mmCIF file with all atom_site columns, C-alpha atoms in Angstrom:
data_model
loop_
_atom_site.group_PDB
_atom_site.id
_atom_site.type_symbol
_atom_site.label_atom_id
_atom_site.label_alt_id
_atom_site.label_comp_id
_atom_site.label_asym_id
_atom_site.label_entity_id
_atom_site.label_seq_id
_atom_site.pdbx_PDB_ins_code
_atom_site.Cartn_x
_atom_site.Cartn_y
_atom_site.Cartn_z
_atom_site.occupancy
_atom_site.B_iso_or_equiv
_atom_site.pdbx_formal_charge
_atom_site.auth_seq_id
_atom_site.auth_comp_id
_atom_site.auth_asym_id
_atom_site.auth_atom_id
_atom_site.pdbx_PDB_model_num
ATOM 1   C CA . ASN A 1 1  ? 29.683 91.269  15.156 1.00 27.68 ? 3   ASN A CA 1
ATOM 2   C CA . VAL A 1 2  ? 27.669 93.347  17.648 1.00 27.15 ? 4   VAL A CA 1
ATOM 3   C CA . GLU A 1 3  ? 24.284 93.950  19.310 1.00 23.96 ? 5   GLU A CA 1
ATOM 4   C CA . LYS A 1 4  ? 21.001 94.565  17.493 1.00 16.64 ? 6   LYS A CA 1
ATOM 5   C CA . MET A 1 5  ? 18.126 97.026  17.848 1.00 14.87 ? 7   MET A CA 1
ATOM 6   C CA . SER A 1 6  ? 15.017 97.053  15.652 1.00 14.85 ? 8   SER A CA 1
ATOM 7   C CA . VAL A 1 7  ? 14.006 100.339 14.021 1.00 13.86 ? 9   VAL A CA 1
ATOM 8   C CA . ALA A 1 8  ? 10.806 101.366 12.241 1.00 10.35 ? 10  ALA A CA 1
ATOM 9   C CA . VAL A 1 9  ? 11.157 103.319 9.004  1.00 8.35  ? 11  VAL A CA 1
ATOM 10  C CA . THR A 1 10 ? 8.480  105.690 7.736  1.00 5.61  ? 12  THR A CA 1
ATOM 11  C CA . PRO A 1 11 ? 6.828  105.177 4.337  1.00 7.80  ? 13  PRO A CA 1
ATOM 12  C CA . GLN A 1 12 ? 8.632  108.082 2.673  1.00 9.45  ? 14  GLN A CA 1
ATOM 13  C CA . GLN A 1 13 ? 11.953 106.959 4.135  1.00 4.61  ? 15  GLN A CA 1
ATOM 14  C CA . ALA A 1 14 ? 11.545 103.402 2.858  1.00 2.00  ? 16  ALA A CA 1
ATOM 15  C CA . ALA A 1 15 ? 10.988 104.764 -0.655 1.00 3.05  ? 17  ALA A CA 1
ATOM 16  C CA . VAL A 1 16 ? 14.167 106.855 -0.708 1.00 2.00  ? 18  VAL A CA 1
ATOM 17  C CA . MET A 1 17 ? 16.276 104.047 0.787  1.00 2.00  ? 19  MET A CA 1
ATOM 18  C CA . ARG A 1 18 ? 14.994 101.772 -1.936 1.00 2.00  ? 20  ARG A CA 1
ATOM 19  C CA . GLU A 1 19 ? 16.256 104.017 -4.742 1.00 2.00  ? 21  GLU A CA 1
ATOM 20  C CA . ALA A 1 20 ? 19.678 104.377 -3.097 1.00 2.00  ? 22  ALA A CA 1
ATOM 21  C CA . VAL A 1 21 ? 20.201 100.610 -2.826 1.00 2.00  ? 23  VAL A CA 1
ATOM 22  C CA . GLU A 1 22 ? 18.901 100.069 -6.365 1.00 2.00  ? 24  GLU A CA 1
ATOM 23  C CA . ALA A 1 23 ? 21.258 102.724 -7.762 1.00 2.00  ? 25  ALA A CA 1
ATOM 24  C CA . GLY A 1 24 ? 24.098 100.888 -6.006 1.00 2.00  ? 26  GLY A CA 1
ATOM 25  C CA . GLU A 1 25 ? 24.909 103.763 -3.654 1.00 2.00  ? 27  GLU A CA 1
ATOM 26  C CA . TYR A 1 26 ? 24.444 101.257 -0.805 1.00 2.00  ? 28  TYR A CA 1
ATOM 27  C CA . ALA A 1 27 ? 24.347 97.476  -0.571 1.00 2.00  ? 29  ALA A CA 1
ATOM 28  C CA . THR A 1 28 ? 21.450 97.360  1.902  1.00 2.00  ? 30  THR A CA 1
ATOM 29  C CA . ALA A 1 29 ? 19.003 99.566  3.761  1.00 2.00  ? 31  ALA A CA 1
ATOM 30  C CA . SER A 1 30 ? 20.517 98.387  7.044  1.00 2.00  ? 32  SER A CA 1
ATOM 31  C CA . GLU A 1 31 ? 23.939 99.763  6.072  1.00 2.00  ? 33  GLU A CA 1
ATOM 32  C CA . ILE A 1 32 ? 22.387 103.143 5.254  1.00 2.00  ? 34  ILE A CA 1
ATOM 33  C CA . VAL A 1 33 ? 20.919 103.310 8.773  1.00 2.00  ? 35  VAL A CA 1
ATOM 34  C CA . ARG A 1 34 ? 24.290 102.300 10.223 1.00 2.00  ? 36  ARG A CA 1
ATOM 35  C CA . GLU A 1 35 ? 25.800 105.304 8.450  1.00 2.00  ? 37  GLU A CA 1
ATOM 36  C CA . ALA A 1 36 ? 23.042 107.606 9.734  1.00 2.00  ? 38  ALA A CA 1
ATOM 37  C CA . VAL A 1 37 ? 23.546 106.626 13.375 1.00 2.00  ? 39  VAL A CA 1
ATOM 38  C CA . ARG A 1 38 ? 27.333 106.883 13.061 1.00 2.00  ? 40  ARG A CA 1
ATOM 39  C CA . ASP A 1 39 ? 27.052 110.417 11.661 1.00 2.00  ? 41  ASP A CA 1
ATOM 40  C CA . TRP A 1 40 ? 24.737 111.393 14.538 1.00 2.00  ? 42  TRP A CA 1
ATOM 41  C CA . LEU A 1 41 ? 27.173 110.021 17.133 1.00 2.00  ? 43  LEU A CA 1
ATOM 42  C CA . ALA A 1 42 ? 30.091 111.893 15.583 1.00 2.00  ? 44  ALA A CA 1
ATOM 43  C CA . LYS A 1 43 ? 28.045 115.098 15.854 1.00 2.00  ? 45  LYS A CA 1
ATOM 44  C CA . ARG A 1 44 ? 27.142 114.359 19.486 1.00 2.00  ? 46  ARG A CA 1
ATOM 45  C CA . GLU A 1 45 ? 30.702 113.330 20.358 1.00 2.00  ? 47  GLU A CA 1
ATOM 46  C CA . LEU A 1 46 ? 32.047 116.587 18.897 1.00 2.00  ? 48  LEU A CA 1
ATOM 47  C CA . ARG A 1 47 ? 29.455 118.785 20.574 1.00 2.00  ? 49  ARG A CA 1
ATOM 48  C CA . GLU A 1 48 ? 30.000 117.083 23.939 1.00 2.00  ? 50  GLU A CA 1
ATOM 49  C CA . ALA A 1 49 ? 33.778 117.429 23.617 1.00 2.00  ? 51  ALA A CA 1
ATOM 50  C CA . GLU A 1 50 ? 33.660 121.136 22.747 1.00 2.00  ? 52  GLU A CA 1
ATOM 51  C CA . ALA A 1 51 ? 31.176 121.991 25.493 1.00 2.00  ? 53  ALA A CA 1
ATOM 52  C CA . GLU A 1 52 ? 33.362 120.135 27.985 1.00 2.00  ? 54  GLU A CA 1
ATOM 53  C CA . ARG A 1 53 ? 36.467 121.875 26.623 1.00 2.00  ? 55  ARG A CA 1
ATOM 54  C CA . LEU A 1 54 ? 35.033 125.335 27.378 1.00 2.00  ? 56  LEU A CA 1
ATOM 55  C CA . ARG A 1 55 ? 33.800 124.277 30.821 1.00 2.00  ? 57  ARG A CA 1
ATOM 56  C CA . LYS A 1 56 ? 37.299 123.153 31.763 1.00 2.00  ? 58  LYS A CA 1
ATOM 57  C CA . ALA A 1 57 ? 38.950 126.204 30.146 1.00 2.00  ? 59  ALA A CA 1
ATOM 58  C CA . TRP A 1 58 ? 36.932 128.486 32.440 1.00 2.00  ? 60  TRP A CA 1
ATOM 59  C CA . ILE A 1 59 ? 37.879 126.744 35.681 1.00 2.00  ? 61  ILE A CA 1
ATOM 60  C CA . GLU A 1 60 ? 41.434 126.562 34.328 1.00 2.00  ? 62  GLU A CA 1
ATOM 61  C CA . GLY A 1 61 ? 41.623 130.320 33.878 1.00 2.00  ? 63  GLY A CA 1
ATOM 62  C CA . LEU A 1 62 ? 40.236 130.985 37.327 1.00 2.00  ? 64  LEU A CA 1
ATOM 63  C CA . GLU A 1 63 ? 42.801 128.625 38.938 1.00 2.00  ? 65  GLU A CA 1
ATOM 64  C CA . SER A 1 64 ? 45.733 129.804 36.751 1.00 2.00  ? 66  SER A CA 1
ATOM 65  C CA . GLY A 1 65 ? 47.363 131.820 39.511 1.00 2.00  ? 67  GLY A CA 1
ATOM 66  C CA . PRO A 1 66 ? 46.744 135.539 40.349 1.00 2.00  ? 68  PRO A CA 1
ATOM 67  C CA . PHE A 1 67 ? 45.312 138.171 37.992 1.00 2.00  ? 69  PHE A CA 1
ATOM 68  C CA . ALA A 1 68 ? 47.323 141.115 36.700 1.00 2.00  ? 70  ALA A CA 1
ATOM 69  C CA . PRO A 1 69 ? 46.386 144.365 34.971 1.00 2.00  ? 71  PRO A CA 1
ATOM 70  C CA . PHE A 1 70 ? 45.594 144.087 31.295 1.00 2.00  ? 72  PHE A CA 1
ATOM 71  C CA . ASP A 1 71 ? 48.090 145.632 28.903 1.00 2.00  ? 73  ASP A CA 1
ATOM 72  C CA . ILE A 1 72 ? 47.986 144.330 25.354 1.00 2.00  ? 74  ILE A CA 1
ATOM 73  C CA . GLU A 1 73 ? 51.297 145.890 24.318 1.00 2.00  ? 75  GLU A CA 1
ATOM 74  C CA . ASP A 1 74 ? 53.098 143.878 26.997 1.00 2.00  ? 76  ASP A CA 1
ATOM 75  C CA . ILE A 1 75 ? 51.537 140.726 25.552 1.00 2.00  ? 77  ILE A CA 1
ATOM 76  C CA . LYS A 1 76 ? 52.399 141.732 21.989 1.00 2.00  ? 78  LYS A CA 1
ATOM 77  C CA . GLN A 1 77 ? 55.964 142.429 23.092 1.00 2.00  ? 79  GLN A CA 1
ATOM 78  C CA . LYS A 1 78 ? 56.299 139.271 25.182 1.00 2.00  ? 80  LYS A CA 1
ATOM 79  C CA . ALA A 1 79 ? 55.198 137.102 22.257 1.00 2.00  ? 81  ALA A CA 1
ATOM 80  C CA . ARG A 1 80 ? 57.913 138.481 19.969 1.00 2.00  ? 82  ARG A CA 1
ATOM 81  C CA . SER A 1 81 ? 60.586 137.610 22.540 1.00 2.00  ? 83  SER A CA 1
ATOM 82  C CA . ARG A 1 82 ? 59.638 133.941 22.124 1.00 2.00  ? 84  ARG A CA 1
ATOM 83  C CA . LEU A 1 83 ? 59.558 134.196 18.327 1.00 2.00  ? 85  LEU A CA 1
ATOM 84  C CA . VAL A 1 84 ? 63.170 135.406 18.105 1.00 2.00  ? 86  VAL A CA 1
ATOM 85  C CA . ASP A 1 85 ? 64.358 132.663 20.460 1.00 2.00  ? 87  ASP A CA 1
ATOM 86  C CA . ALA A 1 86 ? 62.655 130.230 18.076 1.00 2.00  ? 88  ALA A CA 1
ATOM 87  C CA . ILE A 1 87 ? 65.110 131.314 15.368 1.00 2.00  ? 89  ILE A CA 1
ATOM 88  C CA . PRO B 2 1  ? 39.857 148.732 35.548 1.00 2.00  ? 16  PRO B CA 1
ATOM 89  C CA . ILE B 2 2  ? 40.429 145.511 33.571 1.00 2.00  ? 17  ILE B CA 1
ATOM 90  C CA . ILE B 2 3  ? 42.491 142.610 34.942 1.00 2.00  ? 18  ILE B CA 1
ATOM 91  C CA . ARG B 2 4  ? 43.339 139.311 33.243 1.00 2.00  ? 19  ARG B CA 1
ATOM 92  C CA . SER B 2 5  ? 44.250 135.820 34.390 1.00 2.00  ? 20  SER B CA 1
ATOM 93  C CA . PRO B 2 6  ? 47.697 134.292 33.745 1.00 2.00  ? 21  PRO B CA 1
ATOM 94  C CA . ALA B 2 7  ? 45.942 131.753 31.510 1.00 2.00  ? 22  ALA B CA 1
ATOM 95  C CA . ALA B 2 8  ? 44.343 134.526 29.449 1.00 2.00  ? 23  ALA B CA 1
ATOM 96  C CA . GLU B 2 9  ? 47.745 136.071 28.771 1.00 2.00  ? 24  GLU B CA 1
ATOM 97  C CA . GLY B 2 10 ? 48.993 132.644 27.741 1.00 2.00  ? 25  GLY B CA 1
ATOM 98  C CA . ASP B 2 11 ? 46.075 132.431 25.322 1.00 2.00  ? 26  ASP B CA 1
ATOM 99  C CA . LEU B 2 12 ? 46.931 135.707 23.598 1.00 2.00  ? 27  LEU B CA 1
ATOM 100 C CA . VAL B 2 13 ? 50.646 134.889 23.289 1.00 2.00  ? 28  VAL B CA 1
ATOM 101 C CA . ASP B 2 14 ? 49.783 131.465 21.848 1.00 2.00  ? 29  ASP B CA 1
ATOM 102 C CA . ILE B 2 15 ? 47.317 133.157 19.498 1.00 2.00  ? 30  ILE B CA 1
ATOM 103 C CA . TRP B 2 16 ? 49.952 135.730 18.549 1.00 2.00  ? 31  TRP B CA 1
ATOM 104 C CA . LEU B 2 17 ? 52.659 133.147 17.823 1.00 2.00  ? 32  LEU B CA 1
ATOM 105 C CA . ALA B 2 18 ? 50.294 131.075 15.666 1.00 2.00  ? 33  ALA B CA 1
ATOM 106 C CA . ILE B 2 19 ? 49.494 134.031 13.417 1.00 2.00  ? 34  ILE B CA 1
ATOM 107 C CA . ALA B 2 20 ? 53.089 135.229 13.616 1.00 2.00  ? 35  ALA B CA 1
ATOM 108 C CA . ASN B 2 21 ? 54.176 132.012 11.767 1.00 2.00  ? 36  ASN B CA 1
ATOM 109 C CA . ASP B 2 22 ? 52.451 133.489 8.686  1.00 2.00  ? 37  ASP B CA 1
ATOM 110 C CA . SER B 2 23 ? 53.025 137.199 9.387  1.00 2.00  ? 38  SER B CA 1
ATOM 111 C CA . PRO B 2 24 ? 54.086 138.897 12.661 1.00 2.00  ? 39  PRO B CA 1
ATOM 112 C CA . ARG B 2 25 ? 52.361 142.030 11.484 1.00 2.00  ? 40  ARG B CA 1
ATOM 113 C CA . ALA B 2 26 ? 49.034 140.271 11.016 1.00 2.00  ? 41  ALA B CA 1
ATOM 114 C CA . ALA B 2 27 ? 49.345 138.923 14.547 1.00 2.00  ? 42  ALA B CA 1
ATOM 115 C CA . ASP B 2 28 ? 49.688 142.490 15.842 1.00 2.00  ? 43  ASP B CA 1
ATOM 116 C CA . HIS B 2 29 ? 46.482 143.463 14.002 1.00 2.00  ? 44  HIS B CA 1
ATOM 117 C CA . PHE B 2 30 ? 44.444 140.606 15.418 1.00 2.00  ? 45  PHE B CA 1
ATOM 118 C CA . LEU B 2 31 ? 45.578 141.074 19.017 1.00 2.00  ? 46  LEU B CA 1
ATOM 119 C CA . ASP B 2 32 ? 44.955 144.806 18.632 1.00 2.00  ? 47  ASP B CA 1
ATOM 120 C CA . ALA B 2 33 ? 41.484 143.785 17.448 1.00 2.00  ? 48  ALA B CA 1
ATOM 121 C CA . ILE B 2 34 ? 41.076 141.613 20.548 1.00 2.00  ? 49  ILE B CA 1
ATOM 122 C CA . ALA B 2 35 ? 42.126 144.466 22.841 1.00 2.00  ? 50  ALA B CA 1
ATOM 123 C CA . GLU B 2 36 ? 39.794 146.997 21.233 1.00 2.00  ? 51  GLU B CA 1
ATOM 124 C CA . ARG B 2 37 ? 37.066 144.422 21.857 1.00 2.00  ? 52  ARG B CA 1
ATOM 125 C CA . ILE B 2 38 ? 38.016 143.935 25.516 1.00 2.00  ? 53  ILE B CA 1
ATOM 126 C CA . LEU B 2 39 ? 38.286 147.684 26.117 1.00 2.00  ? 54  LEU B CA 1
ATOM 127 C CA . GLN B 2 40 ? 34.694 148.055 24.903 1.00 2.00  ? 55  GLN B CA 1
ATOM 128 C CA . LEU B 2 41 ? 33.721 146.196 28.094 1.00 2.00  ? 56  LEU B CA 1
ATOM 129 C CA . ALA B 2 42 ? 34.692 149.199 30.236 1.00 2.00  ? 57  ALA B CA 1
ATOM 130 C CA . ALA B 2 43 ? 31.831 151.184 28.680 1.00 2.00  ? 58  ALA B CA 1
ATOM 131 C CA . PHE B 2 44 ? 29.501 148.239 27.952 1.00 2.00  ? 59  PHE B CA 1
ATOM 132 C CA . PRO B 2 45 ? 30.075 145.603 30.650 1.00 2.00  ? 60  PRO B CA 1
ATOM 133 C CA . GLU B 2 46 ? 27.220 143.396 29.376 1.00 2.00  ? 61  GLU B CA 1
ATOM 134 C CA . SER B 2 47 ? 28.184 143.203 25.697 1.00 2.00  ? 62  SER B CA 1
ATOM 135 C CA . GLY B 2 48 ? 28.853 139.490 26.138 1.00 2.00  ? 63  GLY B CA 1
ATOM 136 C CA . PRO B 2 49 ? 25.763 137.449 27.000 1.00 2.00  ? 64  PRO B CA 1
ATOM 137 C CA . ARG B 2 50 ? 25.754 135.269 30.096 1.00 2.00  ? 65  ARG B CA 1
ATOM 138 C CA . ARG B 2 51 ? 27.080 131.777 29.316 1.00 2.00  ? 66  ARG B CA 1
ATOM 139 C CA . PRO B 2 52 ? 25.843 129.417 32.056 1.00 2.00  ? 67  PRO B CA 1
ATOM 140 C CA . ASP B 2 53 ? 26.845 126.416 29.936 1.00 2.00  ? 68  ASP B CA 1
ATOM 141 C CA . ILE B 2 54 ? 30.472 127.505 30.444 1.00 2.00  ? 69  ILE B CA 1
ATOM 142 C CA . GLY B 2 55 ? 30.459 128.905 33.972 1.00 2.00  ? 70  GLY B CA 1
ATOM 143 C CA . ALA B 2 56 ? 28.178 130.080 36.738 1.00 2.00  ? 71  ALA B CA 1
ATOM 144 C CA . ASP B 2 57 ? 28.826 133.796 36.207 1.00 2.00  ? 72  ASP B CA 1
ATOM 145 C CA . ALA B 2 58 ? 30.765 133.497 32.950 1.00 2.00  ? 73  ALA B CA 1
ATOM 146 C CA . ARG B 2 59 ? 30.171 135.834 30.023 1.00 2.00  ? 74  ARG B CA 1
ATOM 147 C CA . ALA B 2 60 ? 31.445 135.595 26.457 1.00 2.00  ? 75  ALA B CA 1
ATOM 148 C CA . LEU B 2 61 ? 32.282 138.366 23.985 1.00 2.00  ? 76  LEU B CA 1
ATOM 149 C CA . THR B 2 62 ? 32.828 137.289 20.397 1.00 2.00  ? 77  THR B CA 1
ATOM 150 C CA . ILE B 2 63 ? 35.874 138.370 18.390 1.00 2.00  ? 78  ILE B CA 1
ATOM 151 C CA . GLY B 2 64 ? 36.239 136.439 15.154 1.00 2.00  ? 79  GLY B CA 1
ATOM 152 C CA . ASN B 2 65 ? 35.864 132.736 15.926 1.00 2.00  ? 80  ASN B CA 1
ATOM 153 C CA . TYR B 2 66 ? 37.334 133.208 19.415 1.00 2.00  ? 81  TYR B CA 1
ATOM 154 C CA . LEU B 2 67 ? 35.580 133.947 22.692 1.00 2.00  ? 82  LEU B CA 1
ATOM 155 C CA . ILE B 2 68 ? 36.653 136.438 25.361 1.00 2.00  ? 83  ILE B CA 1
ATOM 156 C CA . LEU B 2 69 ? 35.625 134.565 28.492 1.00 2.00  ? 84  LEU B CA 1
ATOM 157 C CA . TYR B 2 70 ? 35.037 137.010 31.325 1.00 2.00  ? 85  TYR B CA 1
ATOM 158 C CA . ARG B 2 71 ? 33.391 137.787 34.655 1.00 2.00  ? 86  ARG B CA 1
ATOM 159 C CA . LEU B 2 72 ? 32.190 140.964 36.357 1.00 2.00  ? 87  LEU B CA 1
ATOM 160 C CA . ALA B 2 73 ? 33.327 141.859 39.872 1.00 2.00  ? 88  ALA B CA 1
ATOM 161 C CA . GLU B 2 74 ? 32.644 144.826 42.136 1.00 2.00  ? 89  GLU B CA 1
ATOM 162 C CA . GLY B 2 75 ? 34.584 147.666 40.595 1.00 2.00  ? 90  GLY B CA 1
ATOM 163 C CA . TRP B 2 76 ? 36.560 145.767 37.962 1.00 2.00  ? 91  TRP B CA 1
ATOM 164 C CA . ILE B 2 77 ? 36.286 143.387 35.041 1.00 2.00  ? 92  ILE B CA 1
ATOM 165 C CA . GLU B 2 78 ? 38.094 140.043 35.141 1.00 2.00  ? 93  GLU B CA 1
ATOM 166 C CA . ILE B 2 79 ? 39.273 138.613 31.806 1.00 2.00  ? 94  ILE B CA 1
ATOM 167 C CA . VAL B 2 80 ? 39.412 134.876 32.478 1.00 2.00  ? 95  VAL B CA 1
ATOM 168 C CA . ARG B 2 81 ? 40.254 133.250 29.150 1.00 2.00  ? 96  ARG B CA 1
ATOM 169 C CA . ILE B 2 82 ? 40.390 133.542 25.376 1.00 2.00  ? 97  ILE B CA 1
ATOM 170 C CA . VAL B 2 83 ? 39.602 130.198 23.721 1.00 2.00  ? 98  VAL B CA 1
ATOM 171 C CA . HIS B 2 84 ? 38.338 129.241 20.279 1.00 2.00  ? 99  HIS B CA 1
ATOM 172 C CA . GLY B 2 85 ? 34.570 128.973 20.207 1.00 2.00  ? 100 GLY B CA 1
ATOM 173 C CA . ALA B 2 86 ? 32.462 125.840 20.228 1.00 2.00  ? 101 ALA B CA 1
ATOM 174 C CA . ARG B 2 87 ? 33.281 124.250 16.896 1.00 2.00  ? 102 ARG B CA 1
ATOM 175 C CA . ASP B 2 88 ? 30.632 123.967 14.214 1.00 2.00  ? 103 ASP B CA 1
ATOM 176 C CA . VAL B 2 89 ? 29.236 120.653 13.030 1.00 2.00  ? 104 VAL B CA 1
ATOM 177 C CA . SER B 2 90 ? 31.218 120.947 9.788  1.00 2.00  ? 105 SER B CA 1
ATOM 178 C CA . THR B 2 91 ? 33.355 117.815 9.579  1.00 2.00  ? 106 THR B CA 1
#
């Protein structure tokens, strides 16, 4: 299997875990904790990925060649030229 | 004056094409909405709060769920990027 770390549940938490296992929602209190940590990691993994994405996007824009005046209508027109070629 | 990076233009065309799959018209409305939001920076340069988590002197102006990543220079505004915002915890 894998490595082990010992965790200390609070009185109110032990009570709620007990009902869940009894109701059959979970086989054991240890599996419920395993779910809780996995959910937390997913959240952290996502947040870290998104924060890193934006950090890289910024340096990417700065390094993406030289700036040009802003005209939206040119962009709106340029996009259509690629749509027609798609068909 | 307002200048944009080659990446930022690529963002808006990508954004436009995505919406254009559903309706080309709707894509025009959203990009128009983005522009109106960028042009507000000429009168209100600090509408977007500083975003040190993204870049040293980066700022971010919110349009929909997308961010207008920009920087302020002497005499002009530099539009760096337009990326989707940090995604919510909803999984």
